Structure formats: structure tokens, C-alpha cells
Design a protein that fits this description.
The protein is an alpha/beta fold. It is 42% helix and 17% strand. The protein has one domain. Strands 1-3-2-4-5-6-7 form a 7-stranded mixed sheet, sandwiched between helices. This is Alpha/beta-Hydrolases superfamily protein.
Length: 265
């Protein structure tokens, strides 16, 4: 029953298969600008993660089940199996990047390539690793989500979406505001406090780390960290004029250029 709950759709035709997986607080409409071109060359699976505001039944998401990022890769594989879909080029935005990595370790046979878009294995800074945020900042984000959610959604969307693209800032604000605030909080704990650094060494499927030139959520060094740690073939592609965390919304032709180069279409 995962396909109906997750609003799963396969868009396009032909012998190439792709999955587009949205990130924190989003839904599948984040892909709207690039899905027309991609569907000319790929069968594209899009869906909403069960935390999304787009899920019709907002009571489905249980933080007791969703207590680590690991659980989402199980959902992904189950959905692909239910759809008899694969193997795929998996395109994962943000949290979905490491989710796709984990999925590829669980089922290497389902994943031909991984494209990670502004992905990070860890946001929290330590002595040996720079993720972009101090632990105290992550805690404050979460208490902000849990104190005045709507205000937080306005501030957060303005923080992480290219301020040159007001329409995209508003689209993401809208998506965030559709979330159940308790679900957003539960999710933020496991995403913003994640540590998936150790799984990278197990990734054997070819990987492409696509990184905005200036993203407050992911410092450039994280992209190069992932490339270094990933076992299989791996490249880093910087989109130099990309700002913020949503290049598929705010630098979409640049992103399609990179994808065309990487995937030869």
C-alpha cells in the first residue's frame, strides 16, 4: 500500500529508469521544473516521503518507527519492489542523498547510479569534521520548530532557498507549512542530528556528488568529504552560480546540464 500513500507516480517512458527523491519538509512538486526534460529520456519514479505534508493521511507517520534515516531506505526499496521498478539512477536531494546511499548498500542490484544533490552525512561540527553547524545551533532550530512553527517555516525557507528566486522561496515555505508541526520536529531530530559518515565507505555503486557553489546547509568541504569516503567511483560537480539548497528549483537549467553530462542524455 506504499505507492498510494506516498503518491507515487511513474512519469515518462522507455528503458532508462530514474527515481527523484525530495528532502526535508518537501514533496514531489519540488521536481516540477526538471521533470519535463527528464521524462523525455527516463521513466521517472517520483513520490512523497511519509513525513510530507502531501501525505493525505497525516496520522501515518510514527516517530517511533522513523527513529533513524535508515528506515527511509527500507521504504524506498519496498516502494520500488511494489512497483516492480528498477534498477535505477537514483537522484536524491539533501537527506535523500544518504538515504539512497544506504539503499544501494542494502540492495546494490536496484541502483545503477547515485546522484546526490546537496547531500550531507552530518550537519554538526566536531574537531575532525565540519558539517556547517554547531550542535547548539541544531538544538535551537529544533526548539524553534517546536515553539512557533509557522514563523520558523518562513525564516527557514528564506534561509535555505536562493533569495534571487522569490517564487521558489515561497514554494518551499508552502511545502513546509503543510507539514504537521510535530512531524517536522520528529523529522528534524533525525535529519539535522544525523551521522551517516560511516556508511559512505560501504557505497560501491557509482556516485555523483552535485553541490551548489554556495549553500548555507552544506559547506563545499562536505561534498569533497563524501567523494573521498565513497568506495565506488565518485565525482564532485559544483554548480558555481547555485545558491542555497534547492538547485532543482533555483538553478534548474544548470542542474539539467550537469545531469545531461553525467548520464549522457
Amino acid at each position: 500500500g506504499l505507492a498510494s500513500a506516498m503518491n507515487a507516480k511513474i512519469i515518462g517512458s522507455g528503458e532508462r529508469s530514474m527515481v527523484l527523491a525530495h528532502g526535508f519538509g518537501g514533496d514531489q512538486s519540488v521536481w516540477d521544473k526538471i521533470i519535463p526534460v527528464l521524462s523525455q529520456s527516463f521513466k521517472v519514479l517520483v513520490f512523497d516521503w511519509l513525513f510530507s505534508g502531501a501525505i493525505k493521511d497525516q496520522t501515518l507517520y510514527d516517530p517511533s518507527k522513523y527513529n533513524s534515516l535508515d528506515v527511509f531506505s527500507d521504504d524506498l526499496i519496498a516502494l520500488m519492489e511494489e512497483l516492480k521498478f528498477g534498477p535505477v539512477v537514483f537522484v536524491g536531494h539533501s537527506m535523500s542523498g544518504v538515504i539512497g546511499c544506504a539503499a544501494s548498500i542494502k540492495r546494490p542490484d536496484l541502483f545503477t547510479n547515485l546522484l546526490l544533490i546537496a547531500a550531507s552525512p552530518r550537519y554538526i561540527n566536531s574537531e575532525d569534521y565540519k558539517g556547517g553547524f554547531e550542535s547548539k545551533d541544531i538544538d535551537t532550530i529544533i526548539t524553534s520548530i517546536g515553539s512557533n512553527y509557522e514563523a520558523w517555516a518562513v525564516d527557514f525557507s528564506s534561509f535555505v532557498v536562493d533569495s534571487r528566486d522569490s517564487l521558489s522561496v515561497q514554494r518551499f515555505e508552502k511545502s513546509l507549512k503543510k507539514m504537521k508541526p510535530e512531524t517536522a520536529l520528529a523529522l528534524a531530530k533525525i535529519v539535522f542530528g544525523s551521522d551517516e559518515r560511516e556508511i559512505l565507505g560501504q557505497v560501491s555503486v557509482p556516485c555523483h556528488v552535485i553541490q551548489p557553489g554556495n549553500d548555507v546547509v552544506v559547506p563545499v568541504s562536505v561534498a569533497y568529504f563524501m567523494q573521498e569516503k565513497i568506495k565506488g567511483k565518485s565525482t564532485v560537480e559544483i554548480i558555481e552560480d547555485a545558491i542555497g539548497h534547492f538547485p532543482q528549483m533555483t538553478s534548474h537549467l544548470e542542474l539539467l546540464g550537469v545531469m545531461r553530462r553525467l548520464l549522457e542524455f
